[PDB]
């Protein structure tokens, strides 16, 4: 199935030096593609959410009744999450849970012969029906998400160990 | 199953523990009527907590010595305690007739018959356009499913503060 | 064939749904007794007499505890009818003894009608021919409904009259204020 799926690009054709695609069944690979894409979409929102919170741009004007948006724009984005109120993080953890509960319980699961998780709300999903154009588009989602997976690990290797990256660690935000 | 009403768009049919096949067809028919009755009771319970929790109350006297002024002054879960014993005897008595009548229909809903319809006033609802009644049965169950979570949240907020983040500093709780 | 009331048990063989309240409820097999002057005829006559005595006893309690005793008996004044008997016996004991000997002649005649009605076949159990309004003349389906309604209200009143004796002889209050006591004690 690893020949018939997106992710195969021109620099590395089918990059699998440990042969972990054919290690399990097709449900194991279908779990792996659903976990590469979910790690892609989180890290793509993570790389964007680090850069637009290190650039200083923020919402107006008060996040809570006590916590402003501008007080979290001054600190680093990895330390701004510690200052989000506990009722606000519970609002985030509830909608994330209710999206994970829905995508794993929508019919014909992805580990079976089913689709990968789509938009929970609102359900449209914007997908092109042209399979020659859509296959390149989801080839573009993966390696942009692959680069964003390395990028957000570079953002936490610059905020924990001073150094570790040449074009960062001179910046009071990363 | 999906031809049944309560199957909807986001999760339909939602049954991860496969409880629908734990019994026979008559067990599922008992499960549907119990979900429908848990829904209708909780929708009256979520609204009865929201209305009496604000201060909306009837004008005048509930009994000879208990007005609605004193019951709205309390939180609703202990407002039931100051209702007179002849007041709960009147409420529980008409529910007893309502539960006896909807059970004593000529075919039981466990055996394929009708689910509990209105007793007093006994408006007929049979030929009310099965396509429109299909959508409205889904909105009865979905509003029942949400209100059952809601009234269980209201009791949990009234005794364990901080159980729900949206009702922490609420004065009705 | 299984009993209707106890579907794990076989049907008792002398009960075949001919009598009014027959749903096969004889687990102890007491309808099979045929020895010490007692058979299914005697038990049905005993059931029907226990039905009718207990039916009159319930409304006989609920008449006095609502509307008071009859005139000539206003010396009662107690809602507990197990205690109000002894105030009528304390003042006008002759009318109770008038009724108790009038019952004694009626019951000894009814005891002859039971045993002669059993040896012959011209008397149903509990039948005395007391149909003066004549409900039994037409609509045998509607007459069997009255035979079942007598048994159904009589079996219910047997528990009620036995209870009002026992919860009158133990609480010394009366049936309707035992009912109000229980309503305020077990209210939720």
């Amino acid at each position: 199935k690893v020949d018939e799926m997106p992710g195969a690009t021109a620099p590395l054709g089918k990059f699998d030096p440990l042969n972990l695609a054919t290690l399990g069944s097709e449900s194991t690979l279908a779990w792996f593609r659903a976990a590469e894409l979910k790690h892609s979409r989180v890290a793509m929102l993570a790389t964007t959410g680090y850069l637009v919170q290190a650039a200083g741009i923020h919402f107006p004007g008060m996040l809570s009744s006590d916590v402003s948006f501008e007080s979290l724009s001054a600190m680093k984005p990895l330390d701004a999450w510690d200052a989000v109120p506990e009722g606000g993080k519970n609002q985030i953890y509830f909608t994330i849970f209710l999206a994970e509960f829905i995508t794993e319980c929508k019919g014909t699961h992805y580990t079976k012969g089913g689709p990968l998780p789509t938009i929970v709300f609102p359900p449209i999903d914007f997908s092109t029906v042209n399979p020659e154009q859509l296959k390149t588009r989801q080839n573009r989602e993966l390696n942009n998400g692959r680069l964003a997976m390395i990028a957000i690990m570079s953002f936490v290797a610059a905020a924990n160990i001073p150094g570790s990256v040449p074009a960062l660690a001179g910046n009071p935000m990363f | 199953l999906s031809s049944l009403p309560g199957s909807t768009a986001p999760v339909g049919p939602f049954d991860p523990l496969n409880l629908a096949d734990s019994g026979s067809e008559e067990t599922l028919a008992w499960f549907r009527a119990s979900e429908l009755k848990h829904g209708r009771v909780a929708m009256l319970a979520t609204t009865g907590y929201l209305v009496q929790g604000a201060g909306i109350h009837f004008p005048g006297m509930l009994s000879s010595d208990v007005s609605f002024e004193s019951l709205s002054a309390m939180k609703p879960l202990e407002a039931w305690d100051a209702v007179p014993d002849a007041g709960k005897a009147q409420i529980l008595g008409t529910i007893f007739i309502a539960e006896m009548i909807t059970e004593s229909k000529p075919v039981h809903y466990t055996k394929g018959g009708p689910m509990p319809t209105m007793v007093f006033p006994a408006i007929d609802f049979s030929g009310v356009d099965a396509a429109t009644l299909k959508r409205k049965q889904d909105s009865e169950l979905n509003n029942g499913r949400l209100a059952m979570i809601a009234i269980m949240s209201f009791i949990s907020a009234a005794n364990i503060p901080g159980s729900v983040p949206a009702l922490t500093n609420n004065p009705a709780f | 064939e299984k009993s209707q009331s106890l579907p794990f048990m076989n049907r008792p063989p002398l009960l075949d749904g001919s009598m009014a309240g027959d749903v096969g409820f004889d687990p102890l097999g007491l309808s099979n007794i045929d020895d010490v002057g007692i058979d299914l005829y005697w038990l049905r006559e005993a059931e029907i007499k226990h039905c009718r005595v207990a039916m009159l006893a319930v409304v006989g309690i609920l008449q006095v505890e609502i509307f008071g005793p009859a005139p000539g008996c206003e010396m009662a004044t107690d809602k507990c009818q197990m205690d109000a008997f002894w105030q009528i016996w304390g003042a006008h004991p002759q009318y109770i003894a008038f009724g108790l000997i009038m019952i004694m002649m009626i019951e000894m005649i009814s005891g002859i009608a039971t045993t002669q009605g059993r040896e012959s076949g011209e008397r149903a159990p509990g039948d005395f021919g007391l149909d003066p309004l004549g409900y039994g003349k037409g609509d045998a389906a509607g007459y069997a409904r009255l035979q079942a309604q007598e048994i159904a209200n009589g079996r219910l009143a047997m528990f009620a009259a036995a209870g009002e004796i026992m919860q009158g002889c133990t609480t010394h209050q009366g049936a309707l204020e035992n009912l109000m006591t229980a309503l305020r004690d077990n209210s939720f």
Binding site: - | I123, D124, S126, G127, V128 | -
Partner: protein, 208 residues
């Protein structure tokens, strides 16, 4: 049911048949659907007919229209000295109210007992004339619908169109008289009647 759609199409060619609740397809007392659809037609016509006499009767009794002569044995005229016509129903008497209610209650009775009923072969709203049906022993001179005879000679198509503009003037006066009495108990309830209506503030939905 087939004729109820044909009636409402003539009342509005845009809104042909309007039924959100689908109340037109129910029974009430287990009669049939076609017999209760004459009950619903009668009750709509009776609601609109009462409300349209109530709307005229409001604007007469809200202004100062107290007509001579007062018909009593002591005095006690028509109690327009409050004025405010929901207050003026309270200030009649207690015993005068049963004379008004029971007289309408005969006309409610006579529309049920006499010539033909709306939960049968229908024509709802058709009040039976007092001349026929042989139940009243007086007899009385006039009828309720045509006392002076105006106007016999109108064709069927001239009177079939009458109920359709009686139903539409009856539906509007249901909204009309209720917009007055809503401002008698809550102001701002209708937006264009602020300040006109004097806030009766009692209970309009109780006689005594």
């Amino acid at each position: 049911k087939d004729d109820l759609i044909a009636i409402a199409e003539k009342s509005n060619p845009v809104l042909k048949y309007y039924d959100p609740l689908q109340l037109g397809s129910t029974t009430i007392w287990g009669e049939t659907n076609s017999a209760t659809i004459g009950f619903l037609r009668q009750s709509e016509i009776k609601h609109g007919r009462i409300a349209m006499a109530a709307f005229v009767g409001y604007i007469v009794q809200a202004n100062g229209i107290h007509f001579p002569w007062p018909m009593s044995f002591d005095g006690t005229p028509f109690p327009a000295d409050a004025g405010s016509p929901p207050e003026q129903w309270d200030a009649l008497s207690d015993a005068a109210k049963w004379q008004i209610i029971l007289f309408i209650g005969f006309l409610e009775w006579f529309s049920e007992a006499a010539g033909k009923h709306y939960m049968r072969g229908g024509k709802p709203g058709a009040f039976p004339n007092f001349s026929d049906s042989d139940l009243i022993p007086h007899p009385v001179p006039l009828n309720l619908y045509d006392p002076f005879g105006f106007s016999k000679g109108k064709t069927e198509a001239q009177k079939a169109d009458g109920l359709i503009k009686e139903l539409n003037n009856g539906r509007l006066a249901m909204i009309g008289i209720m917009g007055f009495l809503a401002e008698q108990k809550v102001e701002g309830s209708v937006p264009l009647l602020k300040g006109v209506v004097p806030h009766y503030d009692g209970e309009v939905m109780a006689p005594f």
